[PDB]
Structure formats: structure tokens, C-alpha cells
């Protein structure tokens, strides 16, 4: 099949190398996983040594990490917006190791409300009446209020992050290897990395 | 090849096995075990070519199936079990135990040991680390691993493992002034006191060691096996006390023994 060998290549001098044996199994190559965005389908492939590799053919949920907040939640993938390797993979909507994507901010805002007790992603309020009043007030005692106001002074979110929170979609970078681990784990873009990537999307379109 | 080799040619066999070319094409390919096949001694050649208890491969298998040999206190039914270095081969039917120690000429010897001295074994720690739950682990040259070692033991040190318990009785640190035995290379089977250890970063260290006769010889660090404290060994020694004699003196030693016997 596909070959991972080195002896099919021209040598350093540019000369042509004559192979001394036929294709061996251990230097094989398998077709690209080509992960998509959709309902979870995973194919198990038996690999060298009798172990298993997971082909993430189609993925919908992904375990991402805020990083600066130590908040890691299982969100859903909206759609890939960029890929530094090849722009064709973006419009084909293919998930690879280092493609940046848009993810839902619903679990991230939920942790923000239940921990910091400050509004995030809210425009005017009075829109989640069965719960949001309870989580903002909580009628808690003096010690609990004095615990929440300790973290309120440093519960500050950079402008780029909160703006995407109002958008409902956060720019994240994948870190796992779909087709190898069968997952689409990653982290959330922020800081100079987010500012640089944002200029990349702006130059690409708009 | 397409897979692992399970045959061993007679000439390709290790030299210290003392196998001869004429008896057979093959050799007792040692099974996988605690010791490398290049440095082991399979049990078949122990009971046939050394102790003369059995004549061929079938007879030596008969004792194993009668369950009389207890390598390290455990019954081994493998005809080609790799014994290795400093292992108590105990046959309690004859009440005779052997410690498999190299002799002067770098070959495994028939070193009879007393039953009380046969209840323990020295081992060289090959690496130490910490596993799950912060539990320290230690492995030996005999491939046996123990949990909860004494923190004072570092790598390339010696421990006194106890049979039937698998615990530590005592340990010997590796430093200058300790009695060791070379377990590989040209000086294999020699005993001396550590004099110096030259550290070469990125490469193998070299240890200079001086025997009781004053002859000083070097070797690699991995070939160093400390077997005592100061000058007193912790185990019984084979005949010759681990000295090396140049060809001049064992010649006249043989002549003197022939003269005395004649």
C-alpha cells in the first residue's frame, strides 16, 4: 500500500537509489483520517504490536480548556474557521491537530456564572428568569458573600474574550490528534495568539 | 528474518558454556528469563555438562519433571531456564546447593555452598524510580522488582535479597574501598577493591580496581558488581579467591601439583 520507507527517495547527492527489498509491512502508510464535523463515528484500527488506534471520522463534541481560568468543559464544535497548513481544509471542514475552530461558549459562561457570580454574555438581563436571579443573589450568608467578593476583584476578562462571549462562539485551537486518539481536545485562544490569529482571519476575509 | 529466533547454533553458543562442536549441530537456546542468554547458563548444561547427573537432554528433563531443582527457592520445570549469576541452585533431595559464580577464567563454576549461606542472594540494582501513588520501586540485575526500598540505596549498588520473602536484608553502597567482582569483559571473574571511578559524561564510566595481589585493572561501570564491604566478602568465594594468574605461574602450579601427586 502506501509506503513510509525512505529508500524510494533520491539520496542526498541527488542520485537514484535502487531498492534492495520489496515493500515491508512495518513501513506502511494508511489513508488520511479526514475528520469531519458531525455525529460521532469512530473506526477502530488494529495497529503494530496488537494495539489500537482510533479513527475519528466525524466528531461533534470536544473537550476544551480555557487555560487562564483552569476551566475545562465538554462543548460542541460549530465549524472550523482557519488552518495554517492548507486553506482547502477549512472549507472542506476537516479537523486536524492544529486547526483553529469556533466552539460554543455555553459551558464556559455557565461556569463563570456559578463561580464568579458576574454576568457574562448578557445584554440586558431578565432573560433567564427561573435561574439567573437565584445564581446572582443566592441569599447566602456573610462568610459565603465574603468568599465571593474575594474573587470578584480579579474576575476580569480581556476585551477580545468577552466580545466573543457575547458572540456565543469562542476561538479555540485544537491540540489533540484526530485519527490518532479519536478526540478533538484543545484549548481557548487568548492574548497575543488570539490577536495574531484574528488579523489572519481579517486579512483572509473582510 | 520475519520474527524472533528460537534456535541457537552450537558454535554460536557462548564460550563459557564449554560446548563442543561434535556432539550436535544446535545448542540449548535459553528461554527468556531474568538474565541475558549471552551471560546465562541454561539448567540443562548445568546438570549434564557440569554435574554429570544426567547424560542427554531427555534425562535432564526427567529431573525437572520430578521437580527437584529450585532456582531461587522456586521449582523450575524449564530445561533451558537461564540461571545466571549468583543464583542458589538448590537440590534438597541431595541437600546440595550451588552459587553460580564465575571462576578465575571467566566461566561459571560449580561452587558448592552451605545450606545456611544459601538462603540469601546479592543483587545489583539497575535502576530506581517512583511509580503510582508515590511508591518507590527498585529493579535488580536479576530482573526482580521490589516496592518500598530503603531510600539510601542508589543505582549500581548491591542489596541482600532474601529467598522465600523477597525482601532486603542489608545493602552495600558503591564507593571507593569496596570489594567487587567484574561480571563481563576481559577481566570477567576477577575480584578486587575499588580504587577509582572516572566519570565520562555522555559515555560509560571506567572503574579501576585492584586485587589482593596488587594487580590493578580497569573495566566498565556496568561490569562492576560489589560483593562486600571493605575487604571482607559477603558471600563464599569460589576456588582461587577470584585472583587472575598469568600463564607463567599456573603452568608451574600444575607442574607442582603433578609432582606432589606423583
Amino acid at each position: 500500500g502506501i509506503s513510509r520507507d525512505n529508500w524510494h527517495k533520491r539520496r542526498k547527492t541527488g542520485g537514484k537509489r535502487k531498492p534492495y527489498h520489496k515493500k515491508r509491512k512495518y513501513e506502511l502508510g494508511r489513508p488520511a483520517a479526514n475528520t469531519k464535523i458531525g455525529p460521532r463515528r469512530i473506526h477502530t484500527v488494529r495497529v503494530r504490536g496488537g494495539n489500537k488506534k482510533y479513527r475519528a471520522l466525524r466528531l461533534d463534541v470536544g473537550n476544551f480548556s480555557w487555560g487562564s481560568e483552569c476551566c475545562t468543559r465538554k462543548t460542541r464544535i460549530i465549524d472550523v474557521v482557519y488552518n495554517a497548513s492548507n486553506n482547502e481544509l477549512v472549507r472542506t471542514k476537516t479537523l486536524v491537530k492544529n486547526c483553529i475552530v469556533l466552539i460554543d461558549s455555553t459551558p464556559y459562561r455557565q461556569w463563570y456564572e456559578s463561580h464568579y457570580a458576574l454576568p457574562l454574555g448578557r445584554k440586558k438581563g431578565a432573560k433567564l428568569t427561573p435561574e439567573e436571579e437565584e445564581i446572582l443573589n443566592k441569599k447566602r450568608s456573610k462568610k459565603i458573600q465574603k468568599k465571593y467578593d474575594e474573587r470578584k476583584k480579579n474576575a476580569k476578562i480581556s476585551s477580545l474574550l468577552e466580545e466573543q462571549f457575547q458572540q456565543g462562539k469562542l476561538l479555540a485551537c485544537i491540540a489533540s490528534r484526530p485519527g490518532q486518539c479519536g478526540r478533538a481536545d484543545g484549548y481557548v485562544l487568548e492574548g497575543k495568539e488570539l490577536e495574531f490569529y484574528l488579523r489572519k482571519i481579517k486579512a483572509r476575509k473582510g | 528474518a520475519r520474527g524472533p529466533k528460537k534456535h541457537l547454533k552450537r558454535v554460536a553458543a557462548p564460550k563459557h558454556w564449554m560446548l563442543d562442536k561434535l556432539t550436535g549441530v544446535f545448542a540449548p537456546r535459553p528461554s527468556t528469563g531474568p538474565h541475558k542468554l549471552r551471560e546465562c547458563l541454561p539448567l540443562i548444561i548445568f546438570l549434564r555438562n557440569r554435574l554429570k547427573y544426567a547424560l542427554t537432554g531427555d534425562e535432564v528433563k526427567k529431573i525437572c519433571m520430578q521437580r527437584f531443582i529450585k532456582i531461587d527457592g522456586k521449582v523450575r520445570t524449564d530445561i533451558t531456564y537461564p540461571a545466571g549469576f549468583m543464583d542458589v541452585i538448590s537440590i534438597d533431595k541431595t541437600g546440595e546447593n550451588f552459587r553460580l559464580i564465575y571462576d578465575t577464567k571467566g566461566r561459571f563454576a560449580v561452587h558448592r555452598i552451605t545450606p545456611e549461606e544459601a538462603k540469601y542472594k546479592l543483587c545489583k540494582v539497575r535502576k530506581i524510580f517512583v511509580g503510582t501513588k508515590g511508591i518507590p520501586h527498585l529493579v535488580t540485575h536479576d530482573a526482580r522488582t521490589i516496592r518500598y526500598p530503603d531510600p539510601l540505596i542508589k543505582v549500581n549498588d548491591t542489596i541482600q535479597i532474601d529467598l522465600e520473602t523477597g525482601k532486603i536484608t542489608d545493602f552495600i553502597k558503591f564507593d571507593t574501598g569496596n570489594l567487587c567482582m567484574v561480571t563481563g569483559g576481559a577481566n570477567l571473574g576477577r575480584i578486587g577493591v575499588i580504587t577509582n571511578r572516572e566519570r565520562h559524561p555522555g559515555s560509560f564510566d571506567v572503574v579501576h580496581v585492584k586485587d589482593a595481589n596488587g594487580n590493578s585493572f580497569a573495566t566498565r561501570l556496568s561490569n562492576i558488581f560489589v560483593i562486600g564491604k571493605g575487604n571482607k566478602p559477603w558471600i563464599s568465594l569460589p576456588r582461587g579467591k577470584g585472583i587472575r594468574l598469568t600463564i607463567a605461574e599456573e603452568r608451574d602450579k600444575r607442574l607442582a601439583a603433578k609432582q606432589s601427586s606423583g
Binding site: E69, E193, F196 | -
Partner: protein
């Protein structure tokens, strides 16, 4: 110019760029920590890699490569490639029949990190073996020695 001249983003994977910079810490572009490691073997990490801003995953000091194996030496021949140079090693091969030597040379491709900024053609370079960085590169520059230079008129 800067260190961002690619479609990806250059950063050191160990170093976390974002440290939750809030009012308690003056947000005046605080210096991000720089990951560096001593490599052993008596080689000193240069101040260029200590106080630099470049990103190079193949750097012996500020990258994910471990120097192990043979330490060789050579003379710089070509510097016309990105972050790699070609060195020439000259030796004598002995011909037993004639009891005489012959000059033979080998061109070796090594990876030159930008921490060695003032390398020039003809200078001595000591290199260290590592994992295969590219098709023909298996060595990293570890030290640079000038050849009767340091002065230019």
C-alpha cells in the same frame, strides 16, 4: 522584523503566554518567561538564547531536541539555507598497501540556531548528534569558534 512570519503562531509549547494579567499586576507588557535548558557536556548556553525572542523548535537550548551521541567538528562552507548550514570535515584515510594517507572530506548538514548570530564562512563549529531533524540533518550546532578573526577592517 518580528518572530511572526508564518501562517501558524510561533511559541514555546512549555511556556504559558497568558498569566491572567489583572489590576494586581501592572499590565505594561510584562516579559513572558523564556524556556531554556542546559545541555550538559560542558557546553554553555549562550546569552543570545538566554535573552532572545526567537522561536525555534529545533534549538538545542530553547527547543525539543536532546543532544546525545557523537560530538564532532567541522568548518562552515555554505550559509545559504534557513537555520541550517553545511560544514566540511577533512580527514585522512590510511591506505595500508602504500603506507600513506589521502585527503577525504565529508559535507555534513547541521542545524544552526539563531542563537549563534555571528557565524561566518570558514569558522570552526562543534556539533552534537540528535534525532533526525530533516532528511539529511542529524546534528545541531553547539559551539562556534572563530578562525583567526574577531577583527575586520
Amino acid at each position: 522584523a518580528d518572530i511572526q512570519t508564518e501562517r501558524a503562531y510561533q511559541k514555546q509549547p512549555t511556556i504559558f503566554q497568558n498569566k491572567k494579567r489583572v489590576l494586581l499586576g501592572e499590565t505594561g507588557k510584562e516579559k513572558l518567561p523564556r524556556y531554556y535548558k542546559n545541555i550538559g557536556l560542558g557546553f554553555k548556553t549562550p546569552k543570545e538564547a538566554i535573552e532572545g525572542t526567537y522561536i525555534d523548535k529545533k534549538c538545542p537550548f530553547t527547543g525539543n531536541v536532546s543532544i546525545r551521541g557523537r560530538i564532532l567538528s567541522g568548518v562552515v562552507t555554505k550559509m545559504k539555507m534557513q537555520r541550517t548550514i553545511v560544514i566540511r570535515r577533512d580527514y585522512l584515510h590510511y591506505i595500508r598497501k602504500y603506507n600513506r594517507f589521502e585527503k577525504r572530506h565529508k559535507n555534513m548538514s547541521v542545524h544552526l540556531s539563531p542563537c549563534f548570530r555571528d557565524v561566518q564562512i570558514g569558522d570552526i563549529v562543534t556539533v552534537g548528534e540528535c534525532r533526525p531533524l530533516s532528511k539529511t540533518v542529524r546534528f545541531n550546532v553547539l559551539k562556534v569558534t572563530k578562525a583567526a578573526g574577531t577583527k575586520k577592517q
